[PDB]
């Protein structure tokens, strides 16, 4: 008994991956001492901890820029969709950029950019600078536009070499051939597949601007960074055993001989706080670098090709993916082929005709109850059993489960002369 799907549903799914985080850069002397000199002369005694922390944070920032460059800059060139968009029926207007805005982001990227809510001043006055990303979002949203305009017009061939134009209705036939479904399933259901794609993109749009927690991963990355910075600031109000948590009341109330011990207590406490911050940020940056490597691989395989790796590019058989930028992250719209409308049948490993086992070349043997056919494996399209889709490899007495039937040779009727 075998079950073979008779219809299908195109199902666009979403997948958010963090690519980078804020490029914070904590000055060391300003945080620990704060423009004091009696404090800096005592902080000099601790060797190069300040230089090590600044080096670690600068490495993290350079890594955060490299993450974005690795993920998005997969295109050698910058492509543009032609003004006439006859993409076989598919409607990418929700994905292609809107030229009306000054920021050339599309509708879905606009929805994605409003759900990430990226105090932030009082941090600054303690040396807690936040560097700007090298690629401003109007540049990232042009990388993703180039990727979309190459995927739509050329296919998977704009990543191998130079972009090779092909009608989208034919790229989709290639991408069904990839998942094991022949072309005549799209060329005869092109309108239905286009409607399903458009409806799935509309559902993605509706779902994005319905629920606030659609981008929880990016929001939690931002929350972790902001909370680490907030606790780093709040650690400046702790005595650490000193008589006061401010240097300007220790210096202005104690002669240096006995003020040195209090200043040193505060030095040790604030230096430990800053080292803890730097270590946790290093671990967090390792997490984000792993996620950015995953996003780069997902781009290179889902977007620039068509992956056979199960569940890498969405649940179901993968057709194509579309990259949409997001605040400190990337969003993939994994277009997937999901079979539906099952139907139980009766199957058979082979078929005896003249004491010779006939196996299906590509496909399955099934029976509607009394007649034997040969369909595809992922879509019920029953052809008749000829000798052009079956191959003979032996005898009727070795296969376990072989059934009797007739294999229609086409050539003998054509010799009706």
């Amino acid at each position: 008994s075998i079950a073979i799907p008779t219809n299908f549903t195109i199902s666009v799914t979403t997948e958010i991956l963090p690519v980078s985080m804020t490029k914070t850069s904590v000055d060391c002397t300003m945080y620990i001492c704060g423009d004091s000199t009696e404090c800096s002369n005592l902080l000099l005694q601790y060797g190069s901890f300040c230089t090590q922390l600044n080096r670690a944070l600068t490495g993290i920032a350079v890594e955060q820029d490299k993450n974005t460059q690795e993920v998005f800059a997969q295109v050698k060139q910058i492509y543009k969709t032609p003004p006439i968009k006859d993409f076989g029926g598919f409607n990418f207007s929700q994905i292609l950029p809107d030229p009306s805005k000054p920021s050339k982001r599309s509708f879905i990227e606009d929805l994605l950019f409003n759900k990430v809510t990226l105090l932030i001043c009082a941090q600054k006055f303690n040396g807690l600078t936040v560097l700007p990303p090298l690629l401003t979002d109007e540049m990232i949203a042009q990388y993703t536009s180039a990727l979309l305009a190459g995927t739509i017009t050329s296919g998977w061939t704009f990543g191998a070499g130079a972009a090779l134009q092909i009608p989208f209705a034919m790229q989709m036939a290639y991408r069904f051939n990839g998942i094991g479904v022949t072309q005549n399933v799209l060329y005869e259901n092109q309108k239905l597949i286009a409607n399903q794609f458009n409806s799935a993109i509309g559902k993605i749009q509706d779902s994005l601007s319905s629920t606030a927690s659609a981008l929880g991963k990016l929001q939690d990355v931002v929350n972790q960074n902001a909370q680490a910075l907030n606790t780093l600031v709040k650690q400046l109000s702790s005595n650490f055993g000193a008589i006061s948590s401010v240097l300007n009341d220790i210096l202005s109330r104690l002669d240096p001989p006995e003020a040195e011990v209090q200043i040193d207590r505060l030095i040790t406490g604030r230096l430990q706080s800053l080292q803890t911050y730097v270590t946790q940020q290093l671990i967090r940056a390792a997490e984000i670098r792993a996620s950015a490597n995953l996003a780069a691989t997902k781009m290179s395989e889902c977007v620039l090709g068509q992956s056979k790796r199960v569940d890498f590019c969405g649940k179901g058989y993968h057709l194509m993916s579309f990259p949409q930028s997001a605040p400190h992250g990337v969003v993939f719209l994994h277009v997937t082929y999901v079979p539906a409308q099952e139907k139980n049948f009766t199957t058979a490993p082979a078929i005896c005709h003249d004491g010779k086992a006939h196996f299906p070349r590509e496909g399955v043997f099934v029976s509607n109850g009394t007649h034997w056919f040969v369909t595809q494996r992922n879509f019920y399209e029953p052809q008749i059993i000829t000798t052009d889709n079956t191959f003979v490899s032996g005898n009727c007495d070795v296969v376990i489960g072989i059934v009797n039937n007739t294999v229609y040779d086409p050539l003998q009727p054509e010799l009706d002369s």
Binding site: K76, I78, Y79, A122, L131, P133, A146, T153
Partner: protein, 127 residues
Amino acid sequence: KFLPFQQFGRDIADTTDAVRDPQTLEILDITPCSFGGVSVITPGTNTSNQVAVLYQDVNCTEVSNVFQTRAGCLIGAEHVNNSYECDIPIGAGICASYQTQTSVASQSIIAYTMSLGAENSVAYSNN
């Protein structure tokens, strides 16, 4: 709005960001100076000893070759209008390369806007 018994005012870091004059009871607003950090854009010392200087997150009215960018104010580099690939990254799409402009009336550091890549347009058509 300081209440009559409130003299000072603190932030999260326990640093006063508001004070009241003990002679004229007005509400002041303490704020530290326009500090920042300086980055030094530089080609290799083998190639040249001329360096551009970037004042990070500073509107450089604090004091010809003055360029104000989202990363800060860049002093020492002329803002060219075309775009090349990125050699030294400054931030917010602004790079800076040491290019011998003409080999006569030259020896300067430029600061352009990064170019994404060679513009292209596939000749897509339905057939």
